[PDB]
Amino acid sequence: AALLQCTADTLADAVLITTAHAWQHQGKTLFISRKTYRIDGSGQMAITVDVEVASDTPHPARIGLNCQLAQVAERVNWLGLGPQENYPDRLTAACFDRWDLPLSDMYTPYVFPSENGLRCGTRELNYGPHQWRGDFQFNISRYSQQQLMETSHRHLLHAEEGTWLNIDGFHMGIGGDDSWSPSVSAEFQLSAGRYHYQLVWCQK
Amino acid sequence: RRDWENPGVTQLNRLAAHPPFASWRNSEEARTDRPSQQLRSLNGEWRFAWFPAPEAVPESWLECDLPEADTVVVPSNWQMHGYDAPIYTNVTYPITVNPPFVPTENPTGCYSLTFNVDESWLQEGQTRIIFDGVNSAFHLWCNGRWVGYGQDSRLPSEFDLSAFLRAGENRLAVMVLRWSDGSYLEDQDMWRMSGIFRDVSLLHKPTTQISDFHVATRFNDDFSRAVLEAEVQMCGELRDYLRVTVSLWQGETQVASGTAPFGGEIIDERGGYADRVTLRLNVENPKLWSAEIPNLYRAVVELHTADGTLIEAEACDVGFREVRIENGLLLLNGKPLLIRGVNRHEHHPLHGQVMDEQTMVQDILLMKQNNFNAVRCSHYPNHPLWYTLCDRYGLYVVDEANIETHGMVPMNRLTDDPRWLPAMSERVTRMVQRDRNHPSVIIWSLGNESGHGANHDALYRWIKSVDPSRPVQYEGGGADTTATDIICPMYARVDEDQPFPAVPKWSIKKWLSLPGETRPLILCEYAHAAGNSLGGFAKYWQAFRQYPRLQGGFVWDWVDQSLIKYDENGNPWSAYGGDFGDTPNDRQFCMNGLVFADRTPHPALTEAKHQQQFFQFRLSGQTIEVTSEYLFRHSDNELLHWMVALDGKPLASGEVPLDVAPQGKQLIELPELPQPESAGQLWLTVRVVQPNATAWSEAGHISAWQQWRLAENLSVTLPAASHAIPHLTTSEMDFCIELGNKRWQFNRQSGFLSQMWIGDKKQLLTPLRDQFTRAPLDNDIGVSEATRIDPNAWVERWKAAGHYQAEAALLQCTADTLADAVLITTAHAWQHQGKTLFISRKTYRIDGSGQMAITVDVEVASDTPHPARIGLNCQLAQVAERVNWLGLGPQENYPDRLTAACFDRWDLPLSDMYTPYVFPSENGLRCGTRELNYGPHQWRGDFQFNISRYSQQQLMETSHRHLLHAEEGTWLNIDGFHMGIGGDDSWSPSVSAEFQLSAGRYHYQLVWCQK
Ligand SMILES: CC(C)S[C@@H]1O[C@H](CO)[C@H](O)[C@H](O)[C@H]1O
Ligand SMILES: [Mg+2]
Ligand SMILES: [Mg+2]
Ligand SMILES: [Mg+2]
Ligand code: NA
Ligand code: NA
Ligand code: NA
Ligand code: NA
Ligand code: NA
């Protein structure tokens, strides 16, 4: 990530942080992320994200935010599709409602570790003292995308300090027509070039 | 006898039907198809008088000219001359349904002609008169004596006048009835007219004559050899010295010839036909006929004596081709056809239903220039010249019987009634007897929209029996009955089933594989082109190319059936149903063509041309793969041009000769492309150009094209910040922003940008406000009307939800001063009767550069019908001459009809940004636009837009385009999103789900500044 802009403005009843980043690889600009963080008197942080994806780079696996929370709670409560793991092209069985599960159930123990546990069409997520609202997809666990990506067996995984949260505005399909050639249908590929999503973070 | 109210009597003393005759008395004339001294035209000025009924016609009219009659041109429709009104009705009959009766008030046209006849024509032989088309029934008198009667408005009626004529002057009297029992079989969706609308002529034949002849061509497996077989029939006295010689010519070269005396082979216990003979000619390596290469031979049939004295000669163009269905596929000369067809009615805005050579040629050229290779004669036999042109220019033709009983309840009430079998059979058999020698005709059709009756099965079998060289199709009763060799549905969709009871319209992909089905599927009608239509057209062609048995279809239809009328200032304007006082009527439903009545193209024509291309392309790296869809010809008049451009700015271009075999492929390696300096998106555009002119196209004709996005360089560099900082002036009623010579005014009560200034010049006439509706397209309206509302039609759903009445309620309007800009934030709620339909949240950011960045986020209640659009609109005070934009163009294009449009830098005069649909509606939209320029304004982003002198309101309230009045300034509609236009049909919702605005939440952003 290369910082292109970072400014702070004071509004009537809020502070406005504007940022812009460019992700590059060997001179090529893959993605551009422009955000605004508006923190008002009610203590809520409204995050606006607008991303640009070069039309000639392979469509990205996801478009969102992530971070490792210090908090480690027992439950995960959310108003969205559930209760089980569901992805864009595998979410017809999930139902929209208020779900509440222990953190461990938000992780799927696939023998061969990988991205897992996502829940789509979520309008509200609650974890510990935190509350996120909007319309996103998410997975939350004690394993970072990096560890899952480097570990060959699930029994070799180790809980990391705190909790890793991945909140996506968009996530690519998982496919499956077969597992030896690209099988994610075009309608589930992130090829729009320009994406927008908004999140409100606050204290439940 | 009131013969016009008896389906049992369809004619009296009419001669047998036969192929086109000219009775040449010189063989070379027949070979070269030059005019024949024995075939005279009686077209020109005739005498005409109108009467309210046949009972009002004075007997004196039979003996001499009525002084009150007028001199008029013939052929013609008398409604086009103003004697009475033309009636436009779709399904419902124009007369009370009480078969076989017609109204007592039956408009009667009394035609008469005083003409001269050479004595040589009466000293020997037979002189007959031919009426190519009389609508809808008539009696004929010659020199005061009754000659005959005839029905069926679309086929020639011939009578022997030999015993009624005298040398010198003669007078014909023709009483034409508008309505007859034949009218129950002519309920096609088109203007209802009448009169002698086709050619009238006199033909002289010898007493001993060729009375009929059939030409057939059989081939070996690889078509390297063929046998031409000609059955010739004669009338007159049989003599042993009589002979028939049939010669086949390839240009000026005779390639085959055969002679023989009359006397056919034994056929049954009583012998054979002594008055017939069949000649068989061998042809090695025949040049095959096809729409790709219309190779033609000339067959000359000579009736002569053994000593070599010619009696008479007849002839026809011959196209060596084989039509057959095998293993579920329609093949032409052994290859599977892909029908790029269209339905074409015989219509002229000035002459009504009278056809002329120039108009026919103009149609054929435009059709071929737009990649069509087939035409359906909806829904009757055409003017004889039409087939000759299709034979020579090369178009596959579906010849159809003049039989449509759409308005009956049920639809097959007459077609399943044996009492009507006689009338129906004649409409079928006489068509076959007339057109069977035309190579262009590859398929026979039993008629249109008359349900499915036993009479159809009978006539289907009759054709299969008399002419096994052509498939027979018929759509009635479900499109896949026992009366059709081809599944030929009308408006069946690609993926969506429409399970109507008894006569469902299955998805065409699904139809093919139903249990036990094996026939090929070709839509007799699809992609209803009413007004702003053809949305989803590309979906059809994708299926046609993927499924072997989906062999295409015929678009509905070719040309708008609008008629010309004149106002006070004598100015002409396009009229439709009801504009002649005709009532009841079906208003604008008579306009569904790809071109206007004067043959000017509708935007949709370009979409059809693109999807109907004969060359397909693929890109892999620096390699372009060109695949040919031609079945018989090589690309011997094609050149590929390629161009690479960065946001409209050309960087490199080139040309490569195309040399691809039919159904073959060619790989073209593009040279090393330079590296783009500036950021932006590189685009590759290729187009196939025909260097040489052809019979149907000029040199340089573009036949195909395709675009691809190449490398894209995202802009990361930031522009040098401006020293100037905008200033905010706050008042109770407004938020004003000043930046030097520029000012922005936001009304704090409305929450909208109400005015802009550049110096002291106002830039707006109407505030910039959100817009979620559009002046309804034909497809949005469907069959709904004020007297008969269709709650399911899109327009009715929007209206009932209050979309057109919704009022904006201001929820928030604030102003903030940033370090380098002024930020305006607004929020509006659109409600209707306590129901919030949409919520619009915006931010306007004005910086020192003078640019206003507008961000819009919209919420649409999931339970309100999906909106026609999500954008902004305003009336600019400026009226400029040009419109320049970087986006899809240059023609009008919509989400579900934009594959033909190309991304590039376009510049057009403001008038071309408006599409003159006869029935006004939303129009002129251009999608995928990143930059728009008009006068001092420039808008950047990723939007769709239209711009014109007509507000959506005026377009929505105006019934005819000639009543439109350019408003002050210029109306601009910039949409973040726009709904598809649809068109699979125009009487039910047809916009596919992927093109409906159902996401619930939408986001778009624009930057407004000066160019
Ligand atoms: C009015 C429909 C229910 S029937 C529909 O009307 C169309 C009007 O262009 C065409 O005539 C179609 O062939 C016909 O089936
Ligand atoms: Mg009759
Ligand atoms: Mg009809
Ligand atoms: Mg394309
Ligand atoms: Na892994
Ligand atoms: Na096909
Ligand atoms: Na019509
Ligand atoms: Na060529
Ligand atoms: Na209108």
Side-chain angles (χ1 to χ4, degrees), chain B residues 2-11 137 149 151 180-182:
Chain B
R2 297 190 77 73
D3 295 303
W4 59 95
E5 292 188 300
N6 181 346
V9 175
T10 63
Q11 61 71 42
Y149 177 77
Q151 286 184 25
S180 67
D181 51 80

PDB file of all heavy atoms in Angstrom, chain B residues 2-11 137 149 151 180-182, ligand 2:
ATOM      1  N   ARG B   2     -74.606 -12.719 -54.654  1.00  0.00           N
ATOM      2  CA  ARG B   2     -73.804 -12.230 -53.528  1.00  0.00           C
ATOM      3  C   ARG B   2     -72.631 -13.186 -53.308  1.00  0.00           C
ATOM      4  O   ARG B   2     -72.441 -13.730 -52.221  1.00  0.00           O
ATOM      5  CB  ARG B   2     -74.648 -12.131 -52.250  1.00  0.00           C
ATOM      6  CG  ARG B   2     -75.800 -11.143 -52.346  1.00  0.00           C
ATOM      7  CD  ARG B   2     -76.460 -10.903 -50.996  1.00  0.00           C
ATOM      8  NE  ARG B   2     -75.680 -10.012 -50.136  1.00  0.00           N
ATOM      9  CZ  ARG B   2     -75.564  -8.697 -50.314  1.00  0.00           C
ATOM     10  NH1 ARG B   2     -76.176  -8.099 -51.327  1.00  0.00           N
ATOM     11  NH2 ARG B   2     -74.842  -7.974 -49.467  1.00  0.00           N
ATOM     12  N   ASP B   3     -71.850 -13.389 -54.361  1.00  0.00           N
ATOM     13  CA  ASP B   3     -70.711 -14.291 -54.299  1.00  0.00           C
ATOM     14  C   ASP B   3     -69.691 -13.890 -53.241  1.00  0.00           C
ATOM     15  O   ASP B   3     -68.862 -14.702 -52.842  1.00  0.00           O
ATOM     16  CB  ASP B   3     -70.044 -14.372 -55.672  1.00  0.00           C
ATOM     17  CG  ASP B   3     -70.951 -14.989 -56.716  1.00  0.00           C
ATOM     18  OD1 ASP B   3     -71.395 -16.135 -56.503  1.00  0.00           O
ATOM     19  OD2 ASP B   3     -71.222 -14.337 -57.745  1.00  0.00           O
ATOM     20  N   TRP B   4     -69.762 -12.645 -52.776  1.00  0.00           N
ATOM     21  CA  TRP B   4     -68.824 -12.171 -51.769  1.00  0.00           C
ATOM     22  C   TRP B   4     -69.228 -12.541 -50.342  1.00  0.00           C
ATOM     23  O   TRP B   4     -68.600 -12.107 -49.379  1.00  0.00           O
ATOM     24  CB  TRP B   4     -68.617 -10.656 -51.905  1.00  0.00           C
ATOM     25  CG  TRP B   4     -69.862  -9.832 -51.771  1.00  0.00           C
ATOM     26  CD1 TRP B   4     -70.332  -9.228 -50.639  1.00  0.00           C
ATOM     27  CD2 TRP B   4     -70.790  -9.510 -52.816  1.00  0.00           C
ATOM     28  NE1 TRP B   4     -71.495  -8.545 -50.914  1.00  0.00           N
ATOM     29  CE2 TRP B   4     -71.800  -8.701 -52.241  1.00  0.00           C
ATOM     30  CE3 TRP B   4     -70.866  -9.824 -54.182  1.00  0.00           C
ATOM     31  CZ2 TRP B   4     -72.875  -8.200 -52.987  1.00  0.00           C
ATOM     32  CZ3 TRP B   4     -71.936  -9.326 -54.925  1.00  0.00           C
ATOM     33  CH2 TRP B   4     -72.927  -8.523 -54.322  1.00  0.00           C
ATOM     34  N   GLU B   5     -70.274 -13.349 -50.209  1.00  0.00           N
ATOM     35  CA  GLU B   5     -70.716 -13.803 -48.894  1.00  0.00           C
ATOM     36  C   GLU B   5     -70.897 -15.315 -48.934  1.00  0.00           C
ATOM     37  O   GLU B   5     -71.790 -15.866 -48.293  1.00  0.00           O
ATOM     38  CB  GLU B   5     -72.025 -13.116 -48.488  1.00  0.00           C
ATOM     39  CG  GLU B   5     -71.862 -11.629 -48.219  1.00  0.00           C
ATOM     40  CD  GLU B   5     -73.108 -10.994 -47.630  1.00  0.00           C
ATOM     41  OE1 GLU B   5     -74.169 -11.035 -48.287  1.00  0.00           O
ATOM     42  OE2 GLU B   5     -73.024 -10.453 -46.506  1.00  0.00           O
ATOM     43  N   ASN B   6     -70.027 -15.978 -49.691  1.00  0.00           N
ATOM     44  CA  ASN B   6     -70.083 -17.427 -49.844  1.00  0.00           C
ATOM     45  C   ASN B   6     -68.678 -18.019 -49.977  1.00  0.00           C
ATOM     46  O   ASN B   6     -68.065 -17.958 -51.042  1.00  0.00           O
ATOM     47  CB  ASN B   6     -70.916 -17.781 -51.084  1.00  0.00           C
ATOM     48  CG  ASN B   6     -71.046 -19.281 -51.298  1.00  0.00           C
ATOM     49  OD1 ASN B   6     -70.329 -20.075 -50.688  1.00  0.00           O
ATOM     50  ND2 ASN B   6     -71.957 -19.674 -52.184  1.00  0.00           N
ATOM     51  N   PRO B   7     -68.154 -18.613 -48.893  1.00  0.00           N
ATOM     52  CA  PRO B   7     -66.814 -19.198 -48.958  1.00  0.00           C
ATOM     53  C   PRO B   7     -66.742 -20.361 -49.947  1.00  0.00           C
ATOM     54  O   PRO B   7     -65.660 -20.867 -50.246  1.00  0.00           O
ATOM     55  CB  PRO B   7     -66.557 -19.623 -47.514  1.00  0.00           C
ATOM     56  CG  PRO B   7     -67.918 -19.966 -47.021  1.00  0.00           C
ATOM     57  CD  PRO B   7     -68.773 -18.855 -47.578  1.00  0.00           C
ATOM     58  N   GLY B   8     -67.901 -20.773 -50.455  1.00  0.00           N
ATOM     59  CA  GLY B   8     -67.953 -21.854 -51.424  1.00  0.00           C
ATOM     60  C   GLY B   8     -67.588 -21.349 -52.811  1.00  0.00           C
ATOM     61  O   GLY B   8     -67.183 -22.122 -53.684  1.00  0.00           O
ATOM     62  N   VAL B   9     -67.735 -20.043 -53.015  1.00  0.00           N
ATOM     63  CA  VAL B   9     -67.410 -19.421 -54.295  1.00  0.00           C
ATOM     64  C   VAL B   9     -66.264 -18.436 -54.100  1.00  0.00           C
ATOM     65  O   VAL B   9     -66.441 -17.361 -53.531  1.00  0.00           O
ATOM     66  CB  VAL B   9     -68.633 -18.684 -54.882  1.00  0.00           C
ATOM     67  CG1 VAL B   9     -68.240 -17.940 -56.154  1.00  0.00           C
ATOM     68  CG2 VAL B   9     -69.739 -19.691 -55.189  1.00  0.00           C
ATOM     69  N   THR B  10     -65.082 -18.814 -54.571  1.00  0.00           N
ATOM     70  CA  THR B  10     -63.905 -17.968 -54.424  1.00  0.00           C
ATOM     71  C   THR B  10     -63.491 -17.370 -55.760  1.00  0.00           C
ATOM     72  O   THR B  10     -62.573 -16.550 -55.833  1.00  0.00           O
ATOM     73  CB  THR B  10     -62.725 -18.771 -53.848  1.00  0.00           C
ATOM     74  OG1 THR B  10     -62.364 -19.813 -54.763  1.00  0.00           O
ATOM     75  CG2 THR B  10     -63.109 -19.393 -52.506  1.00  0.00           C
ATOM     76  N   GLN B  11     -64.174 -17.792 -56.819  1.00  0.00           N
ATOM     77  CA  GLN B  11     -63.890 -17.303 -58.160  1.00  0.00           C
ATOM     78  C   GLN B  11     -64.896 -17.845 -59.144  1.00  0.00           C
ATOM     79  O   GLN B  11     -65.609 -18.806 -58.863  1.00  0.00           O
ATOM     80  CB  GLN B  11     -62.480 -17.717 -58.612  1.00  0.00           C
ATOM     81  CG  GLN B  11     -62.224 -19.229 -58.696  1.00  0.00           C
ATOM     82  CD  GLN B  11     -62.943 -19.920 -59.854  1.00  0.00           C
ATOM     83  OE1 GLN B  11     -62.989 -19.411 -60.974  1.00  0.00           O
ATOM     84  NE2 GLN B  11     -63.488 -21.096 -59.586  1.00  0.00           N
ATOM     85  N   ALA B 137     -62.103  -8.532 -53.183  1.00  0.00           N
ATOM     86  CA  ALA B 137     -62.881  -9.377 -54.089  1.00  0.00           C
ATOM     87  C   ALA B 137     -63.402  -8.506 -55.223  1.00  0.00           C
ATOM     88  O   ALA B 137     -63.539  -7.290 -55.064  1.00  0.00           O
ATOM     89  CB  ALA B 137     -64.047 -10.019 -53.345  1.00  0.00           C
ATOM     90  N   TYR B 149     -65.243 -13.470 -61.691  1.00  0.00           N
ATOM     91  CA  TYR B 149     -65.158 -13.066 -60.300  1.00  0.00           C
ATOM     92  C   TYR B 149     -63.911 -13.684 -59.669  1.00  0.00           C
ATOM     93  O   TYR B 149     -63.425 -14.716 -60.133  1.00  0.00           O
ATOM     94  CB  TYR B 149     -66.406 -13.563 -59.570  1.00  0.00           C
ATOM     95  CG  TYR B 149     -66.437 -13.274 -58.095  1.00  0.00           C
ATOM     96  CD1 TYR B 149     -66.747 -11.999 -57.621  1.00  0.00           C
ATOM     97  CD2 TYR B 149     -66.165 -14.278 -57.166  1.00  0.00           C
ATOM     98  CE1 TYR B 149     -66.793 -11.733 -56.257  1.00  0.00           C
ATOM     99  CE2 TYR B 149     -66.206 -14.021 -55.793  1.00  0.00           C
ATOM    100  CZ  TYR B 149     -66.524 -12.749 -55.351  1.00  0.00           C
ATOM    101  OH  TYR B 149     -66.605 -12.498 -54.003  1.00  0.00           O
ATOM    102  N   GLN B 151     -61.357 -13.980 -55.729  1.00  0.00           N
ATOM    103  CA  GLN B 151     -61.016 -13.659 -54.348  1.00  0.00           C
ATOM    104  C   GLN B 151     -59.527 -13.922 -54.065  1.00  0.00           C
ATOM    105  O   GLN B 151     -58.788 -14.348 -54.959  1.00  0.00           O
ATOM    106  CB  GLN B 151     -61.915 -14.448 -53.382  1.00  0.00           C
ATOM    107  CG  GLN B 151     -63.348 -13.902 -53.324  1.00  0.00           C
ATOM    108  CD  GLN B 151     -64.239 -14.605 -52.304  1.00  0.00           C
ATOM    109  OE1 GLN B 151     -63.763 -15.177 -51.318  1.00  0.00           O
ATOM    110  NE2 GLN B 151     -65.541 -14.539 -52.525  1.00  0.00           N
ATOM    111  N   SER B 180     -65.464  -9.119 -48.034  1.00  0.00           N
ATOM    112  CA  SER B 180     -65.990 -10.336 -48.646  1.00  0.00           C
ATOM    113  C   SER B 180     -65.771 -11.484 -47.668  1.00  0.00           C
ATOM    114  O   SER B 180     -65.216 -11.286 -46.587  1.00  0.00           O
ATOM    115  CB  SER B 180     -65.269 -10.645 -49.961  1.00  0.00           C
ATOM    116  OG  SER B 180     -63.905 -10.981 -49.744  1.00  0.00           O
ATOM    117  N   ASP B 181     -66.210 -12.683 -48.036  1.00  0.00           N
ATOM    118  CA  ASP B 181     -66.005 -13.822 -47.159  1.00  0.00           C
ATOM    119  C   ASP B 181     -64.499 -14.090 -47.100  1.00  0.00           C
ATOM    120  O   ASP B 181     -64.002 -14.696 -46.155  1.00  0.00           O
ATOM    121  CB  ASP B 181     -66.785 -15.049 -47.664  1.00  0.00           C
ATOM    122  CG  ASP B 181     -66.534 -15.347 -49.130  1.00  0.00           C
ATOM    123  OD1 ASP B 181     -65.490 -15.961 -49.446  1.00  0.00           O
ATOM    124  OD2 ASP B 181     -67.383 -14.966 -49.968  1.00  0.00           O
ATOM    125  N   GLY B 182     -63.778 -13.612 -48.109  1.00  0.00           N
ATOM    126  CA  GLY B 182     -62.334 -13.782 -48.130  1.00  0.00           C
ATOM    127  C   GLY B 182     -61.689 -12.980 -47.008  1.00  0.00           C
ATOM    128  O   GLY B 182     -60.589 -13.300 -46.559  1.00  0.00           O
TER     129      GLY B 182
HETATM  130 MG    MG C   2     -67.159 -15.911 -51.943  1.00  0.00          MG
END
